[PDB]
Amino acid sequence: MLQPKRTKFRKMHKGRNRGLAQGTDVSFGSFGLKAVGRGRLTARQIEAARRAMTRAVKRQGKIWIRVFPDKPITEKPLAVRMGKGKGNVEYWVALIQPGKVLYEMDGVPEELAREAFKLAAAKLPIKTTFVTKTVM
């Protein structure tokens, strides 16, 4: 479960999630799993998809995770009223915009990369698509 080792501040404004992604090319491997939709990826989701990916290729090749969950999310406990300060940090997310390459793979055939990425996408709350490296 990824999570910043330390941060300047404990809590963060909700913010919004507009725009298209930066980092839309396969930059490290040969195959990538790219986001088509918009949303949040929790650290548990990122890790559940990593495990499914890694078991499918029998821990061969190499896998990059291009996203990191650096945004803390707070929640108010059950049976607590409104007010009395911001809630407690409960988990961490990465904000995803369309076009974001989420994972990359190398050192395996394309057919196996497609199958491994399919099993991973089934763990994620956002629609995705399989991409390959381009020369330009």
Partner RNA sequence: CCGAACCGACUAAUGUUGAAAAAUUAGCGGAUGACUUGUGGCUGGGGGUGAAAGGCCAAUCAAACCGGGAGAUAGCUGGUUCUCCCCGAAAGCUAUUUAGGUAGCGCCUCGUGAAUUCAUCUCCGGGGGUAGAGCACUGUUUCGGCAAGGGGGUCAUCCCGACUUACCAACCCGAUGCAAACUGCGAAUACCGGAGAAUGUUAUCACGGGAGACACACGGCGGGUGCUAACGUCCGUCGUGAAGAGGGAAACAACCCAGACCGCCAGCUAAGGUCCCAAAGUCAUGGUUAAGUGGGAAACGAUGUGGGAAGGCCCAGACAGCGUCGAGUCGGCCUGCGCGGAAGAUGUAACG
Partner RNA sequence: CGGGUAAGUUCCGACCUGCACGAAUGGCGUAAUGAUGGCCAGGCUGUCUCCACCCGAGACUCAGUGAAAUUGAACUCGCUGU
Partner RNA sequence: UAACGGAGGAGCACGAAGGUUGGCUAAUCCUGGUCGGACAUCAGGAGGUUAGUGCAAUGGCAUAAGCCAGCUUGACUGCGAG
Partner RNA sequence: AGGUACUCCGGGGAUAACAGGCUGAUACCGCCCAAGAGUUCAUAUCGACGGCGGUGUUUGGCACCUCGAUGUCGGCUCAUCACAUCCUGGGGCUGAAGUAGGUCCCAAGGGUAUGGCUGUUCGCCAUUUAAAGUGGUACGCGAGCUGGGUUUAGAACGUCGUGAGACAGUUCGGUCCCUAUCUGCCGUGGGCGCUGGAGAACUGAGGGGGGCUGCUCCUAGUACGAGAGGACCGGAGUGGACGC
Q: Which residues form the interface with RNA (CB under 7 A)?
A: 2, 4-23, 27-28, 42, 44-45, 47-49, 51-52, 55, 64-68, 70-71, 74-76, 78-87, 95, 119, 121-125, 127, 129
CB of 60 to RNA, least distance (A): 14
Q: How far is the CB of 2 from RNA (least distance, A)?
A: 7
Instruction: State in angstroms the smallest separation of the CB of 109 from RNA.
Output: 16
Write a three-state SS string for 45-108.
Answer: HHHHHHHHHHHHCCCCCEEEECCCCCEEEEECCCCCCCCCCCCEEEEEEEEECCCCEEEEEECC
Per the CB < 8 A criterion, the answer to whether 24 and 99 are in contact is yes
Pick between residue 10 and residue 109 the one whose CB is nearest to RNA. 10
